[PDB]
Amino acid sequence: MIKIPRGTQDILPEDSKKWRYIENQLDELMTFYNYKEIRTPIFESTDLFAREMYTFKDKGDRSITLRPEGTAAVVRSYIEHKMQGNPNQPIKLYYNGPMFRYYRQFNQFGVEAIGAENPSVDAEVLAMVMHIYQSFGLKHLKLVINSVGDMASRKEYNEALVKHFEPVIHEFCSDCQSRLHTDPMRILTAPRITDFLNEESKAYYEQVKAYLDDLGIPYTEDPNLVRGLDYYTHTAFELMMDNPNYDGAITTLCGGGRYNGLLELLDGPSETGIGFALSIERLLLALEEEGIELDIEENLDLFIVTMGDQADRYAVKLLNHLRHNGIKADKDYLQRKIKGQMKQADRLGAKFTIVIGDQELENNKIDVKNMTTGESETIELDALVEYFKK
Amino acid sequence: MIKIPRGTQDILPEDSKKWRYIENQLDELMTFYNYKEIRTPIFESTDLFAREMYTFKDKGDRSITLRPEGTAAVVRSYIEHKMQGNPNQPIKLYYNGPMFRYYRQFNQFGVEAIGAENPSVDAEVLAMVMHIYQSFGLKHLKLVINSVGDMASSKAYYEQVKAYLDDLGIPYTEDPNLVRGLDYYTHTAFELMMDNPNYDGAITTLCGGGRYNGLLELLDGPSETGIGFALSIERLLLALEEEGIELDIEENLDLFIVTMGDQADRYAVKLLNHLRHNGIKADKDYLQRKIKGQMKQADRLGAKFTIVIGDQELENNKIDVKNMTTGESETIELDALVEYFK
């Protein structure tokens, strides 16, 4: 037999419902925040991610690559569709789909607000990342933020790292050595970025936290929560779950921050932007560890047990009827004995059951047995759709 | 600039909503029929589809392949998870996701009922293929069926399936010439056609599928019988277009907050957070613009209502909630805002 690829899993019927619940809930939340969904191809030109991955000179020897994350593609689409010129700004977009980093296949969800550097925007995305997780009932969350200032602060902070490291530059590998001159931060005792926020940067950050205080969102400032990528500006954050059944008891549920320089590396405008990404798998596991259950009703409303051909052929029209009316119903293919049909009813979670036989077919009346209370209710056969509908 | 791969397209904010409407309607329909969703990886061992395509010796020089369709993967899962031994049969499963054929990326949706060769089951899937399309308002549908008998070749099977179709009141066209060469395609083979002047021939194939006995074994599995069908969400979308159909979408903002100066604006931030925590779709103005500009954005976003918070309103604790269509204002206390919108 053929086996799935390594580091790959199928989401089978027991879990698919949990995924759809989560996915649907996120689409709704985005509705309140007004972020719109975009769906990028599974692969992009290798040259987008060039700026391990599954690359293959296919597409006519052209090099393509299974996307490892959705930001570059949201940016590649934003640029290609000339969104910078959109009358509606900031461009508030979200995505949700499988990513591929050599599980080799994982499902990340994320948002990107591009075109509006503004503390109130940051606050909106932070209140949101909190809202998402709290909407599911998670509770031992802990939002951690920091600021790496603007492009100015970073320029003057980089110089300090060079003043610092350079006099011992040869003690570093050609790797780290090369990096003194392009971005010392990647070299990282020595200076800290957060001690270089200018006056403006220090007020943006103070406004972001002001807002968090306003909205009553608790946060932890972790001066050491920084990002080396020079196109990463201002707000940086990580949402975390305190949970003892974790490797080291703590886990990062979500993460993100602002950026200024990303778009230009992808051949685009100097737009500013903020976003975050989150894994549905991890969210799912968080609910697990916290011992949380989702309102996934996954139950058949009516299972039809039939006796003999006449009654059975009637169950066919009936089923078609009920299904055309939003009732979840199912009958017995496989032709089995009542015990077997009744068990199937039970297996499928049939809230109710009915046994149609020829006597019921004539009297035009069946007993609808509530499978939990085991209480029957006698109604006319015609009522069936009506009775279940209402 | 870097460009999208050839024969590939993005589903931007104006369409993603149409996709979600359809996708969501299909999961519900599947609910009534009792088909459960399964999600297979984007790629499989080349050797499954081996039984052009994007194949690459990755995964550690191992040969993998971007799946071209979802049937062999549902069967690969079915076998690997030893579903044949499941107490609940037939295995009724569905899927919906991107497929890759050398648009190179297309999004096919489909069902598979495995383990119960039975006319009443074929009837159930044909009634469904008709239901799905009818649920969206399409109207010039035309179900075409045929049967290629059993592997020994049945007739009565086929007469029963059509018996049922007649029972159910489902009209069909028997096309003797609608057959499939694959010897594991046992009985019924069908296609849902849509007659519409816009397509060449003035008809198009919306959906297609049928039974099979021999597929499972090629994939190293049991001799289970199975029926199924596949469908393109893109084509379905286009069908609604051609028939001139609109979906009950219209993503429209509930409230756009226009603010005057810092005080008012910093108030709009708690307000927003509040409303959003209550199922109200609201948005304010980042980008700091003139009222005319904020008012246009409100219009741009489809804001059903609008409010302008400024310091005077901030003290009087009262604002005029103008209905953006009638242009009629309603003055309420600022506190009511959330309560009033809820």
Q: Are strands A105-114 and A272-279 parallel, antiparallel or unpaired?
A: antiparallel
Full domain range(s) for residue B285: 250-339
Interface check for A32 against chain B (CB to CB < 8 A): the answer is yes
Nearest Cα neighbor of B133 from B35, B274, B41, B22 is B22
B326 min Cα distance to partner chain A (Å): 23
- The rounded distance, in Å, linking the Cα atoms of A64 and B224 is 38
Phi-psi region of B82 (alpha: psi -120 to 50; beta: other; left: phi over 0): left
**Omega before residue A90 within 30° of 0, cis:** yes
Contact: B167, A327; criterion CB under 8 Å: no
Query: How far apart are alpha carbons B195 and B210 in whole angstroms?
Result: 21
Last residue of a domain, one of A296, A323, A345: A296
Q: How many residues does chain A have?
A: 390
Of A10, A88, A328, the CB nearest to B32: A328
Q: How far apart are CA A199 and CA B327, in angstroms?
A: 44
Are A58 and B54 inside 8 Å of each other by CB?
Answer: yes
Q: How far is CA B41 from CA B68, B161, B243, in A?
A: 12, 34, 35
Closest CA to A81 of A143, A36, A142, A119: A36
Same-domain pairing of B171 and B264? no
| B66–A contact, CB cutoff 8 A | yes
Six token digits for residue A147 = 């600021």
CB contact under 8 A, B93 and A6: no
Q: Are residues B327 and B211 in the same domain?
A: no
Helix (H, G, I), strand (E, B), or coil: what is residue A26? helix
CB contacts of B293 in chain A (<8 Å) are none
Pair (B32, B141) in one structural domain = yes
Q: Is the CB of B289 inside 8 Å of chain A's CB atoms?
A: no
Phi, psi of A174 (to 5 degrees): -55, -30
From chain B residues 92-151, the ones with a CB under 8 A of any chain A CB are 93, 98, 100, 102, 104-105, 116, 118, 120-121, 123-124, 127-128, 131
Q: List, in sequence order, every residue forming a beta bridge with A41; answer none if it has no partner.
A: none
Q: How many residues does chain B have?
A: 342
Best of A263, A328, A333 to disrupt the B interface (most B CBs within 10 Å) is A333
Q: Inter-chain contact A13–B4, Cβ cutoff 8 Å?
A: no
Nearest CB neighbour to A80, from listed B3, B56, B277: B3
The enclosing H or E element of A64 equals strand A64-66
Q: What is the maximum alpha-carbon separation in chain B? A: 86
Picking from A245, A278, A296, the residue at the C-terminal end of a domain is: A296
Q: Which residues of B touch A319 (CB under 8 A)?
A: 124
CA dist A125 and A140 (Å) reads 20
The partner residue sitting opposite A348, judged by closest CB among B88, B275, B288, is B88
Q: Please identify, among B192, B223, B249, the residue that sits at the C-terminal boundary of a domain.
A: B249
A306: left (phi over 0), alpha (psi -120 to 50) or beta: beta
Q: For residue B277, what is the nearest residue in chain A, using CA coordinates?
A: A131
Strand, helix or coil for residue A84: helix
CA-based nearest residue in chain B for residue A118: B286
A277 touches chain B (CB under 8 A): no
How far apart CA B7 and CA B52 sit, in angstroms, is: 14
| Residue A145 C-alpha, separation from nearest chain B C-alpha, in angstroms | 19
Across the interface, whether the CB atoms of A333 and B48 are under 8 A apart is answered no
CA atoms within 13 A on the CB side of A60: 4
Q: Alpha carbon of A93 to those of A238, A287, B173: distances in Å?
A: 20, 26, 46
The token pair that represents B12 in the structure block: 């931007």
Task: Give the chain B residue whose CA is nearest to the CA of A44.
Answer: B5
Q: Do B41 and A9 lie within an 8 Å CB cutoff?
A: yes
CB contact under 8 A, B220 and A56: no
Whether B272 and B282 have beta carbons less than 8 Å apart is answered as: yes
Query: Which residues lie across from B147 on neighbouring strands?
Result: B188
Q: In this structure, are strands B91-100 and B64-66 parallel, antiparallel, or unpaired?
A: unpaired
First vs last Cα of chain A: how many Å apart?
A: 48
Q: Distance of CA A44 to CAs A65, A100, A354, Å?
A: 5, 12, 54
Cβ of B5 within 8 Å of Cβ of A102? The answer is no
Q: Do A209 and A315 have their domain in common? A: no
Contact A146, A209 (CB under 8 A): no
Q: At what angle do helices B13-33 and B233-242 cross, to 10 degrees?
A: 110
Q: How far is A208 from chain B (nearest CA, A)?
A: 11
Q: Which one of B64, B105, B133, B273 makes the best mutation probe of the A interface by having the most chain A beta carbons within 10 Å?
A: B273
Q: What tokens appear for A365 in the block?
A: 């009346």
Answer whether B243's CB lies under 8 Å from B138's CB: yes
- Whether A307 and A231 map to the same domain: the answer is no
Window A:233-252, CB contacts with B under 8 Å: none
Q: How far is CA A239 from the centre of its chain?
A: 14
Residues in B touching A60 (Cβ below 8 Å):
6
Asked if B80 and A211 come within 8 Å (Cβ–Cβ), the reply is no
- Within a 10 A sphere around the Cβ of A285, how many other Cβ atoms? 17
Contact B1 A38 (CB under 8 A): no
What is the CA angle A256-B41-B19, rounded to 5?
70
Tell me the two tokens of residue B271: 């307000």
- What one-character DSSP code corresponds to residue A4? P
Residue found under tokens 């009958």: A331
Q: Is A38 on the interface with B (CB under 8 A)?
A: yes
- Write out the two tokens for A261: 């320089």
Tell me, rounded to whole angstroms, the distance of Cα A195 from its chain centroid.
Answer: 34
- What is the residue-wise DSSP string for B124-177? HHHHHHHHHHHHTT---EEEEEEE---S---HHHHHHHHHHHHHHT---EE-TT
Whether residues B240 and B257 fall in one domain = no
User: Cα–Cα distance between A323 and A339 in angstroms, integer?
Assistant: 25
Domain of residue B156, CATH code: 3.30.930.10
A171 Cα to chain B: minimum distance (Å): 36
Tokens 């053929």 belong to A2
Among A1, A121, A214, whose Cβ lies nearest the Cβ of B220?
A1
Domain shared by A9 and A79, yes or no: yes
CATH code (residue A375): 3.40.50.800
End-to-end alpha-carbon separation of chain B, Å?
45
CB contact under 8 A, A41 and B81: no
Query: Which residue type, as a one-letter code, is found at position B259?
Result: T
Residues B44, B174: one domain?
yes
Nearest CA in chain A to B281: A32
CB contact under 8 A, B296 and A87: yes
Tell me the C-alpha distance between A372 and A301, whole Å: 12
Indicate whether B216 and B266 sit together in one domain.
no
Q: Which amino acid is at B151?
A: M
Instruction: Judge whether B87 is closer than 8 Å to chain A, CB to CB.
Output: yes
The tokens for B226 are 């199975």
Contact B88 A123 (CB under 8 A): no
Interface test with B, best of A320, A325, A351, A389 (most B CBs within 10 A): A320
* Neighbour tally for B246: CB within 10 Å: 10
Closest residue of chain B to A53, computed from CA coordinates: B58
* Nearest-angstrom CA–CA distance, A133 and B80: 34
Q: β-pairing, A302-306 with A352-356?
A: parallel
Q: Tell me, in Å, the resolution of the deposited structure.
A: 2.7
Tell me how far apart the 2 most distant CA atoms of chain A are, in Å: 99
Residues 6+ apart with CB under 8 A from A102: A52, A53, A54, B58, B59
Are the beta carbons of A20 and B37 separated by less than 8 Å? yes
Q: Write out the E strands in chain B.
A: 36-37, 43-45, 55-56, 64-66, 91-100, 105-114, 141-147, 173-174, 188-195, 203-212, 226-232, 255-259, 282-284, 305-309, 318-323, 329-333
Are A40 and A67 contacting, i.e. CB atoms less than 8 angstroms apart?
yes
Asked whether residue B182 falls in the same domain as residue B264, the answer is: no
For residues A274 and A92, give the distance between their C-alpha atoms in angstroms, rounded to a whole number: 10
Mutation target for A interface from B28, B52, B286: give the one with most A CBs within 10 A: B286
The reply to whether A130 and A265 lie within a common domain is: yes
Q: How many CB pairs under 8 A join A and B?
A: 259
Number of domains in chain B: 2
If asked whether residues A291 and A307 sit together in one domain, one would say: no
| H-only helix segments in chain A | 13-33, 46-49, 58-61, 71-80, 119-135, 151-165, 174-178, 201-215, 262-265, 280-289, 308-323, 338-347, 358-363, 383-389
